[PDB]
């Protein structure tokens, strides 16, 4: 019985017939990622015009910022975005059927001596996106980018001394788009790790210092920021959780979230709960309903528990993972709520994909997400229709969970590379 | 322009050798150019070069498992950060080439031997007839006490939640190649023993040496001192027992070396290991301490507490990590004080910088040849590498100060060398 194949997605096929590509890399990027992208839009019930709209913006504004087509045979920028270092990833917000994607902007100067840590390329991507969406605001972006990524002089200093960082993934910042309502919302992610190296500060001081400075002009972010920092400090100097990155929405400050992400090396339900409740600071009924769903997801997904080291910096393409990763959580500073809001990440990368898709579909059924439950596995398989589906262990990078307005919110972050007809065209 | 693949013994043996599978052939071409070039530059005689390379090819290569690639199942050895089961070291102070490997056979990693506790017996069987001075008395003792038996293996295999991402290596062998003969050593990793028995690695190792000391009372004093030193570091010590080695030679000639992993990478940490927390303060200890400090100053290890790294790295992935220090303490039967050897763990550091540090140290000791040829030879092992960007060749530099002689070895990535 012939099976569904994302390369048959009509919007993918039509756009392929329409599009001008002026280099090979972009063309490869399009054919590598668009089948899954178009198929995901379709199955998430985006109207046909919206499928076209989003795939065109992606092709015209984003693909030219994904650098050369990734192979193991030629140099490429390795992005912190995925374990394979590819600078593009789709996520399906399953609870709302919203498609999002994240990319790390890369341009000609990325990784050359003019931008050895890729701290400049993001401006050029913003330049292409800004005219498309009136609501895009860069005020907070500029602030965090200035405080938390390498400037030019820090870059040249670290490039000369790059013995200090060896094989460190260099990503400074990434952008993501939430696709909704014929519009998009823009988000950024900023990785202060190398900024920490060069300033001799810790990522925590950088992140919290920058947010405090911002709270001078935006006092409403201060109360959740204070609670967050008190929670972190309370975990002590041997905490298994450490600040890793910060995100904010690129819209007006009044509407923008700041999200502070902790890497949590202890994979256990207890560690997850502690993050969820900020060590028992959140005891409200809403938190507790959310908590029952965290526990349910924990029990379905069956992550391998225990302390997890940092993984190998990246996996070459084609390499089957043999690893399990730290959890993650972010804490959102809402301006209308004094208590930071958590979102937790079940880091499934390396786990059996069909098992994980089964855990997901069970969770979907239980939530009454009838259609999600019905279509999820079939659709997932269609993204990689030539794979040995039962042996895949690298599609599901993360499952997110938060509980917003008494509403379960879940996204899956999926390997997004060499999809559809591409493939034909020990210790765990 | 030097290239290890031009090494004559490697070229000539490559014309001579029968290989019965691809894996052994790949292993030979992957490792032999560096191994032959290393023997050449360490001034081994032509006959020794051939002799060591042949025994290596015939007795050892068939025990290295499938050729390591990222795209097929292989045994992941603790021996290297890439899980490859072969590594050459050069004892720079004596020009002695040594190598370590983890025996692997057909049953390794299967339900007949899921933790690779049996393969070693087969490798020993191949080596024994070549070296009369091999003795297994202490080896049998330690392996018995410190590695999984068949029963514990099946239990652990059925309960591998208890293992998780842990590298499973039970035991390794090393050959010191001197004077047309070789001395055999073993390294025994009691980590999984500890899981199944409920013992700490400390209890296992010290318990095992104490049971041995019944038959060999002379090892007891340095063992008591080592243990008193370790106990003195308390339950939150950043140093803990990791492995044990002994020579596979007659007990009267055999050293037992107990290894501590030291997560605190600092000069202070290294000095404390060197002097066993101030218990060693004789002139010879202090002379050695000077050299330790000088090495410290030259090598410039990234200081601070180092976490356990990823269990292993995929081949081809350059590291971004810095690792704990190591030290071993030797129990000599004629000396009541355990003798330390410390390890500067350079893995992940810029290799040319480390090579420059080493060259300077060689100069200062007047190892004038060592200093002249080291960088050149090192480059010739990986002649197509972007040498200045390499940060994974030097795994470790060892140092001890033996009968008032500086003793130094470098442990080097030994994989895909020469014209690979
Ligand atoms: N790979 C990222 C985590 C991540 C996965 N998907 C993402 C999408 C957007 C931002 C971050 C992510 C990290 O290690 O930190
Ligand atoms: N890889 C070993 C240390 C080591 C490096 N080279 C060696 C050679 C022989 C024995 C041990 C080693 C460990 O992690 O414990
Ligand atoms: C998967 C990880 C670690 C980060 C991305 S979180 P995100 O911005 O996608 O979160 P939301 O869009 O707010 O759900
Ligand atoms: C490099 C590490 C951690 C261990 C091996 S020590 P070794 O047996 O090679 O030391 P010697 O041969 O006694 O100098």
Curated annotation (Swiss-Prot), chain A:
GO terms for biological process: fumigaclavine C biosynthetic process. Dimethylallyl diphosphate binds at residues 100, 187, 189, 257, 259, 261, 343, 345, 409, 413. Its EC number is 2.5.1.34. GO terms for molecular function: prenyltransferase activity; tryptophan dimethylallyltransferase activity. Homodimer. Belongs to the tryptophan dimethylallyltransferase family. This is Tryptophan dimethylallyltransferase. The gene is dmaW.
